[PDB]
Design a protein around this nucleic acid. Structure first.
Ligand SMILES: NC[C@@H]1O[C@H](O[C@H]2[C@@H](O)[C@H](O[C@@H]3[C@@H](O)[C@H](N)C[C@H](N)[C@H]3O[C@H]3O[C@H](CO)[C@@H](O)[C@H](O)[C@H]3N)O[C@@H]2CO)[C@H](N)[C@@H](O)[C@@H]1O
Ligand SMILES: NC[C@@H]1O[C@H](O[C@H]2[C@@H](O)[C@H](O[C@@H]3[C@@H](O)[C@H](N)C[C@H](N)[C@H]3O[C@H]3O[C@H](CO)[C@@H](O)[C@H](O)[C@H]3N)O[C@@H]2CO)[C@H](N)[C@@H](O)[C@@H]1O
Ligand SMILES: [K+]
Ligand SMILES: [K+]
Ligand SMILES: [K+]
Ligand SMILES: [K+]
Ligand SMILES: [K+]
Ligand SMILES: [K+]
Ligand SMILES: [K+]
Ligand SMILES: [K+]
Ligand SMILES: [K+]
Ligand SMILES: [Mg+2]
Ligand SMILES: [Mg+2]
Ligand SMILES: [Mg+2]
Ligand SMILES: [Mg+2]
Ligand SMILES: [Mg+2]
Ligand SMILES: [Mg+2]
Ligand SMILES: [Mg+2]
Ligand SMILES: [Mg+2]
Ligand SMILES: [Mg+2]
Ligand SMILES: [Mg+2]
Ligand SMILES: [Mg+2]
Ligand SMILES: [Mg+2]
Ligand SMILES: [Mg+2]
Ligand SMILES: [Mg+2]
Ligand SMILES: [Mg+2]
Ligand SMILES: [Mg+2]
Ligand SMILES: [Mg+2]
Ligand SMILES: [Mg+2]
Ligand SMILES: [Mg+2]
Ligand SMILES: [Mg+2]
Ligand SMILES: [Mg+2]
Ligand SMILES: [Mg+2]
Ligand SMILES: [Mg+2]
Ligand SMILES: [Mg+2]
Ligand SMILES: [Mg+2]
Ligand SMILES: [Mg+2]
Ligand SMILES: [Mg+2]
Ligand SMILES: [Mg+2]
Ligand SMILES: [Mg+2]
Ligand SMILES: [Mg+2]
Ligand SMILES: [Mg+2]
Ligand SMILES: [Mg+2]
Ligand SMILES: [Mg+2]
Ligand SMILES: [Mg+2]
Ligand SMILES: [Mg+2]
Ligand SMILES: [Mg+2]
Ligand SMILES: [Mg+2]
Ligand SMILES: [Mg+2]
Ligand SMILES: [Mg+2]
Ligand SMILES: [Mg+2]
Ligand SMILES: [Mg+2]
Ligand SMILES: [Mg+2]
Ligand SMILES: [Mg+2]
Ligand SMILES: [Mg+2]
Ligand SMILES: [Mg+2]
Ligand SMILES: [Mg+2]
Ligand SMILES: [Mg+2]
Ligand SMILES: [Mg+2]
Ligand SMILES: [Mg+2]
Ligand SMILES: [Mg+2]
Ligand SMILES: [Mg+2]
Ligand SMILES: [Mg+2]
Ligand SMILES: [Mg+2]
Ligand SMILES: [Mg+2]
Ligand SMILES: [Mg+2]
Ligand SMILES: [Mg+2]
Ligand SMILES: [Mg+2]
Ligand SMILES: [Mg+2]
Ligand SMILES: [Mg+2]
Ligand SMILES: [Mg+2]
Ligand SMILES: [Mg+2]
Ligand SMILES: [Mg+2]
Ligand SMILES: [Mg+2]
Ligand SMILES: [Mg+2]
Ligand SMILES: [Mg+2]
Ligand SMILES: [Mg+2]
Ligand SMILES: [Mg+2]
Ligand SMILES: [Mg+2]
Ligand SMILES: [Mg+2]
Ligand SMILES: [Mg+2]
Ligand SMILES: [Mg+2]
Ligand SMILES: [Mg+2]
Ligand SMILES: [Mg+2]
Ligand SMILES: [Mg+2]
Ligand SMILES: [Mg+2]
Ligand SMILES: [Mg+2]
Ligand SMILES: [Mg+2]
Ligand SMILES: [Mg+2]
Ligand SMILES: [Mg+2]
Ligand SMILES: [Mg+2]
Ligand SMILES: [Mg+2]
Ligand code: NA
Ligand code: NA
Ligand code: NA
Ligand code: NA
Ligand code: NA
Ligand code: NA
Ligand code: NA
Ligand code: NA
Ligand code: NA
Ligand code: NA
Ligand code: NA
Ligand SMILES: [Zn+2]
Lengths: 89, 258
RNA sequence: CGGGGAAACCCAGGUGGAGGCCUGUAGCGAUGCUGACGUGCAAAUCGCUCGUAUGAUUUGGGUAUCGGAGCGAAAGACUCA
RNA sequence: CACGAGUUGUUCGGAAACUGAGCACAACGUUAUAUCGUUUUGUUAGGAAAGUGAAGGUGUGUCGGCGGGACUGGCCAUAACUGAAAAGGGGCAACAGAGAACCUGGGAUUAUAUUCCAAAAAGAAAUUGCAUGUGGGA
RNA sequence: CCCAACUGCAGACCGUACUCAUCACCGCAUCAGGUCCCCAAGCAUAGAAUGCUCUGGUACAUAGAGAAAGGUACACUCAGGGAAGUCGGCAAAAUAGAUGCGUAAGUUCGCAAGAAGCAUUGGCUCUGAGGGCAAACCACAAAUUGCCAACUCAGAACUGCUUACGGCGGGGAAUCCAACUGUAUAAUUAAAACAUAGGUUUGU
RNA sequence: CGGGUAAACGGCGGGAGUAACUAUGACUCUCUUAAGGUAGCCAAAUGCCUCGUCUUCCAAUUAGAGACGCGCAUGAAUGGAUUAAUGAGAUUCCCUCUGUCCCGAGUUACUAUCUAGCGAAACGACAGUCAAGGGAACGGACUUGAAGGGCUAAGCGGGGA
RNA sequence: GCACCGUCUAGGUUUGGGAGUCCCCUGUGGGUACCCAACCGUGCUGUAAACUGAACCAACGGGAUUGCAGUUCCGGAGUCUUGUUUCGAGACAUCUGCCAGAUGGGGAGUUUGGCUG
RNA sequence: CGACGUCGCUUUUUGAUCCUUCGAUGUCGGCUCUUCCUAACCUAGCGCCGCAGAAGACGCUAAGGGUUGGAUUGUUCACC
RNA sequence: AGUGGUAAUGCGAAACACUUGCCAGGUAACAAAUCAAUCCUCCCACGGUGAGCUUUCUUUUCACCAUAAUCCACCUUGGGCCUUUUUACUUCGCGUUGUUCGGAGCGGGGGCUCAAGAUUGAAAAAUGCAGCUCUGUACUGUCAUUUGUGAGUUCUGCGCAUUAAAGCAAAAACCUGGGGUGU
RNA sequence: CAGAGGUGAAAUUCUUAGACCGCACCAAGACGAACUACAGCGAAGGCAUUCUUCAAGGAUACCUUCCUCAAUCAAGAACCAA
RNA sequence: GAUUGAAAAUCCCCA
RNA sequence: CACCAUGUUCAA
């Protein structure tokens, strides 16, 4: 059964550090501990192994990206821009 | 009086970099003949974390251009670098994330990192996690390239200076609240001895201009002159303005009309 | 693993063992008795009691920074009573 | 207190012989004066700090093969003429990090012992360095 | 010249006693202070709590005599009242383990909480439950048959208390201050002071 | 000289009149600042007057709490207000509890006490009974009186300024 | 004025010239399809989306002392140097000394009357 | 009882002074404990009254004896 | 001038030999918690020797019952891998106490290998301990001569391995290969 | 080169340190005029430059399929200008 | 009483 | 497009 109503993973902190700082940290903490899709090997097996470092448990690939998520939205924009400029040349 | 803490740190002593467990300086490969004329293709062998740095580092293995051996350079990995990726470095390298090209070969509007301020300096700009430079324009008459630095300032550099395509990995690090003094303790363990911080008003007047008084207060304006001697230059150094900024953040730093 | 629900989702039992989390040894400290002692066991100690005790934790050796200087989570604290 | 005694190692600890936080000889620079500074972010010094040597040519010895103990193509060691290749001087700093070939038994002491024990070594091993002979190859 | 299994000879230097502490070190000393590491038994018990104990160690720390007043104590008790004492509940008393039930305001929903409160606990003789092991393509009650270890929990009948080792929270209603964990005047001040995460500003 | 800047240092008014009982002053006049304290908060760890005034708490409260605000001298990162959890922090009350007290008593170990052995220090002008008087205005010495046989043990804290 | 120093090229495009498909059985193995000139280009054998191979101590060809091995050189691997290691800046300061001024409790030294119910 | 005046006493208030003490005389209050003073609150007697009685005012001799428990305040003091 | 196996990979008496010319990897070299846990410790049954107690009980109480390195030969558990079957996941299966895993190859059959043990001997009874016999010897003959689905125990399984804006030294020395030498 | 701005009229404001005005540019953020309609699309809120794209949606057409699968709705769900 | 249709209003201690 | 605020209570 559900053990917390809203705290979730932040319940390890008890009553400390404030609700809003806990909520803001929680979103990034869930992301950094979650499994992310690997474009190689097509599995949901990317886990962080240091800030900015992600290794896939499936294909053992290591990728540098994102402090708390596998890929940042800025990187996605940059990827499309580089591809578009490469075609333009 | 006694020496202020900010002056004492200049002596080095116990305030120097905690360099043990660091992998070494991160740089582009040497701008040799192969880079200036053709290209050098390497392979990313590992993505590694260094204490005191948010950005991930990439170990890239190259063949030695003149000898039968390998080189194994160490660079700041852009976001998206992966083990086994082929890295192209040189004049003829294609425009792709992770490749190193001369700035004059890169199209305007592209996003770059590990930018050489001087040709051959092996990367000095846009290195911290999540940072990048934007190529504004090229000027072939003078052979210069205009860039937008992460701080917002615009800087012109020679077009032979190299840059890496992409943004520095590990972005968004400062978005998570620390929540604990202990986490800051671990954060600064790998950097240097600069934490925790004692306010100047909490010290005694013998060791700080803001010290003393029967109330905790600075009894003089905290904006100090640019020409103030060390020990007196504390507070807001040469502040053009103070107070809460409203209606737009201006670009900081020195003013360069060029 | 069950129970609801058209859906979104919700409810219940277990497993699991998180925390500058709590009780409490060693350890590291030092609240009160304004207790003992106060030509003392002792130029700061003793007793009961007390803080904390997985962490910004405690500790050995080595090494680095001093004399208008060193060092200081800041008491003008500490730098061989 | 007086007198006389006791501490036994190829393997235990250190050193020979590793790097670490670091130290600072040389070198260079500075200072009226070195009793000052730089000296590991791969690393001294405007900086010629390698005396080490791959393939070869020349003699000795150890060999395999052919032809008629020796004679020539071929192997390996031994001394000498060159000359590939090696960028970044010499050291210190750990008796709790790295490294390290030995174990029990004992009637063997008044005191030392994985340190002493002698031919039934109480004994059983491990590990170095040079040698001989045997055997297998050159 | 290179190897294998032997074999022959030779394996240098320094340290090595003793101590490591309520007597061998420091504190003027054989000073109730301070001082790093390893090995760590039995019973009770949650146990490196605390009490007692085999092995090892020890009776060494001036003693003898011995109910004066007054003292100190890691010693107690006190009828009736119950903070009237006192600046002040200082000191002391009190609470006490485990198990079941039950638990308010407030709240950042995590807590507050062991909130508060109520009940049970011994001994003895039984009962039930929680297992292991071994065995003769369909389906086959090995859905039973033997043997056996180490413990825990629950439920009964009978029979007790003088409420009886040690060890072990008193609780509640509010105000002020600091968010919190921490740090800190070695030798009169531990706090509301410092730090902290968070917020803002400056230089580049 | 001319601009900018307060999450730089900091600062953030006075007098007079006025509503069909009275009072009060939404309102008006006037002097003046760089701006004249806004949101809040309070006899607050900040209020001189002050033990302010009301309510509550008690048989009784210069204390506590809740209100009021003419605030000597509250007030917004010199941060204002609020705040669950936390605290060897400061404060008030209640239940429980008690030798804190009414009001003292009894018991124990170790002392003190006596002995054997051992054996100091502080201190030490000289000394050491009082009353009054004068006196450097508070005598153990002096004046005049009153006491005073000598030597010892355990206590004690009036004096020996 | 003329001549000398003063020399070559990957690749791209178009102008002239000469001159040598075969074995084994549809399939397999081996091999031939060139040279020079002109213009552009400038030192140029590899990549134009990226997921981890290997590359050294010369093969070979010429000139002298059929094929083969020796001793030499020369190519393979262009040549040259009014010289700068390369790049950036550049006769200013990002430089060196001196003179001069402003600022300057960051710091030093010193002072901070007297009479007085 | 006592205006306008006037004459004194006391050292349980403050002040004035600076004689003693700065090679130091421990500085508030309370607790505890003893003693002294009388300008007498109670207690023993006695006058006087706008003293009927009762309850009281004033005065005399007399300090032998007695003179409390609490709330608030560190308080002396104050108040209940 | 190595060699066998479809493969995982095997084979050592000295041509499977030399490699500091050179190159590339590996060892040295680091890491939580949970759960299993080694050597050893403790406690139970089991049987011997001696000792304690025995008015009365106690088939009892206590002590002891030990096997060092170095070697030889070669059932259990856990991991990695190979081959085979893959019609293995259509309103699935394997597995942990535990947060998993699989056409990028799960499960089943048969194998290869690694890490911990177990066992077999050599060492090694000739040692050690206790008891006991006989004859003045620190004499001398001789007898004793293991079970636990119990409780602890960090050796180990154990890492690309912990909270992490913390991601956890280096080198000597050594090992293997790629090339080449042998040719 | 001497004013500009603004208004009912003015002033706050800018300006010989060159404002306003003129030309061609550069930067940045919004917006998509005229065409724009008693016109279109969308469940409502809403939606207007071009090009390239990704899923939809209504209407029409049919001698396709199918066979009552529907209407409206407490609870519940999603969207919703400023 | 003035005015009004009737009223309002208006006028006649130490430490 | 400067600036136009107010009208006591019932009842004709
Ligand atoms: N919104 C801000 C404006 O300023 C006003 O401010 C008002 C008050 O805040 C202020 O008055 C002062 C004030 O200066 C000062 N800081 C505090 C003082 N207590 C106030 O006093 C006022 O407030 C109290 C409380 O009601 C009253 O009892 C008192 O009578 C009144 N004078 O001045 C104004 C008095 O009328 C109002 N806050 C508000 O009506 C107005 O809109
Ligand atoms: N050369 C002497 C050294 O200068 C150093 O300090 C010097 C520097 O900090 C500083 O140099 C600054 C420089 O920072 C800044 N980036 C540029 C500036 N031009 C320099 O200035 C200096 O150099 C120029 C040379 O053109 C001189 O004209 C000038 O006087 C001098 N102050 O000026 C100081 C005086 O030269 C050392 N701190 C000092 O101890 C030592 O004396
Ligand atoms: K500190
Ligand atoms: K007693
Ligand atoms: K809530
Ligand atoms: K502090
Ligand atoms: K104020
Ligand atoms: K706490
Ligand atoms: K006399
Ligand atoms: K000067
Ligand atoms: K100054
Ligand atoms: Mg440093
Ligand atoms: Mg601070
Ligand atoms: Mg201070
Ligand atoms: Mg100062
Ligand atoms: Mg100050
Ligand atoms: Mg402050
Ligand atoms: Mg302040
Ligand atoms: Mg804790
Ligand atoms: Mg605790
Ligand atoms: Mg200590
Ligand atoms: Mg005391
Ligand atoms: Mg005492
Ligand atoms: Mg004493
Ligand atoms: Mg101070
Ligand atoms: Mg002696
Ligand atoms: Mg070092
Ligand atoms: Mg350095
Ligand atoms: Mg150098
Ligand atoms: Mg050394
Ligand atoms: Mg060691
Ligand atoms: Mg050794
Ligand atoms: Mg032994
Ligand atoms: Mg023996
Ligand atoms: Mg000994
Ligand atoms: Mg010894
Ligand atoms: Mg010894
Ligand atoms: Mg010891
Ligand atoms: Mg001692
Ligand atoms: Mg000494
Ligand atoms: Mg038990
Ligand atoms: Mg204990
Ligand atoms: Mg115990
Ligand atoms: Mg002793
Ligand atoms: Mg003693
Ligand atoms: Mg009682
Ligand atoms: Mg009571
Ligand atoms: Mg009380
Ligand atoms: Mg009281
Ligand atoms: Mg009282
Ligand atoms: Mg009081
Ligand atoms: Mg207490
Ligand atoms: Mg509730
Ligand atoms: Mg605090
Ligand atoms: Mg607060
Ligand atoms: Mg804590
Ligand atoms: Mg604390
Ligand atoms: Mg102190
Ligand atoms: Mg303190
Ligand atoms: Mg203290
Ligand atoms: Mg009026
Ligand atoms: Mg105004
Ligand atoms: Mg107030
Ligand atoms: Mg107050
Ligand atoms: Mg009270
Ligand atoms: Mg109040
Ligand atoms: Mg402000
Ligand atoms: Mg303030
Ligand atoms: Mg506290
Ligand atoms: Mg004297
Ligand atoms: Mg006298
Ligand atoms: Mg005297
Ligand atoms: Mg006295
Ligand atoms: Mg140059
Ligand atoms: Mg000064
Ligand atoms: Mg004077
Ligand atoms: Mg009079
Ligand atoms: Mg005087
Ligand atoms: Mg004095
Ligand atoms: Mg004196
Ligand atoms: Mg005295
Ligand atoms: Mg009288
Ligand atoms: Mg009397
Ligand atoms: Mg009397
Ligand atoms: Mg490892
Ligand atoms: Mg290590
Ligand atoms: Mg399947
Ligand atoms: Mg573990
Ligand atoms: Mg348009
Ligand atoms: Mg419907
Ligand atoms: Mg909006
Ligand atoms: Mg009208
Ligand atoms: Na001030
Ligand atoms: Na200790
Ligand atoms: Na110095
Ligand atoms: Na001697
Ligand atoms: Na020996
Ligand atoms: Na007032
Ligand atoms: Na006198
Ligand atoms: Na005086
Ligand atoms: Na009387
Ligand atoms: Na299989
Ligand atoms: Na102009
Ligand atoms: Zn993957």
């Amino acid at each position: 059964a559900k053990r917390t109503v809203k705290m979730g993973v932040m319940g390890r902190y008890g009553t400390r550090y404030g609700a809003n700082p806990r909520k803001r940290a929680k979103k990034l903490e869930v992301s950094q501990h979650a499994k992310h899709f690997c474009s190689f090997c097509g599995k949901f097996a990317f886990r962080r192994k240091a800030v900015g470092i992600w290794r896939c448990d499936g294909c053992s690939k290591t990728v540098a990206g994102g402090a708390y998520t596998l890929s940042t939205p800025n990187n996605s924009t940059v990827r499309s821009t580089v591809r578009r400029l490469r075609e333009l040349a | 009086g006694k020496t202020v803490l900010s002056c004492r740190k200049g002596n080095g002593s116990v305030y120097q970099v905690h360099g043990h467990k660091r992998l070494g300086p991160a740089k582009l490969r040497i701008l040799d003949y192969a880079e200036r004329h053709g290209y050098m293709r390497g392979v990313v062998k590992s993505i590694e974390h260094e204490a005191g740095r948010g950005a991930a580092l990439a170990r890239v293995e190259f063949r030695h251009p003149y000898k039968f051996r390998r080189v194994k350079e160490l660079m700041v990995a852009p976001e998206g670098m992966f083990t086994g990726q082929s890295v192209f470095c040189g004049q003829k390298a294609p425009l792709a994330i992770g490749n190193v090209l001369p700035l004059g070969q890169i199209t305007e509007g592209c996003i770059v990192c590990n930018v050489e301020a001087k040709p051959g300096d092996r990367g000095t700009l846009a290195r911290a996690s999540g940072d990048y430079c934007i190529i504004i324009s090229h000027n072939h008459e003078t052979g210069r390239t205009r860039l937008k630095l992460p701080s917002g300032q615009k800087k012109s550099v020679p077009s032979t200076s190299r840059a890496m395509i992409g943004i520095i990995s590990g972005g968004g690090r400062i978005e998570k609240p620390v929540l604990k003094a202990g986490n800051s303790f671990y954060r600064f363990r790998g950097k240097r001895n600069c934490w925790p911080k004692v306010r100047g008003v909490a010290r005694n007047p013998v060791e700080h201009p803001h010290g003393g008084g029967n109330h905790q207060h600075i009894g003089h304006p905290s904006t100090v002159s640019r020409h103030s001697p060390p020990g007196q230059k504390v507070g807001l150094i040469a502040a053009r303005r103070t107070g809460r900024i409203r209606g737009g953040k201006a670009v900081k730093g020195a003013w360069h009309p060029e």
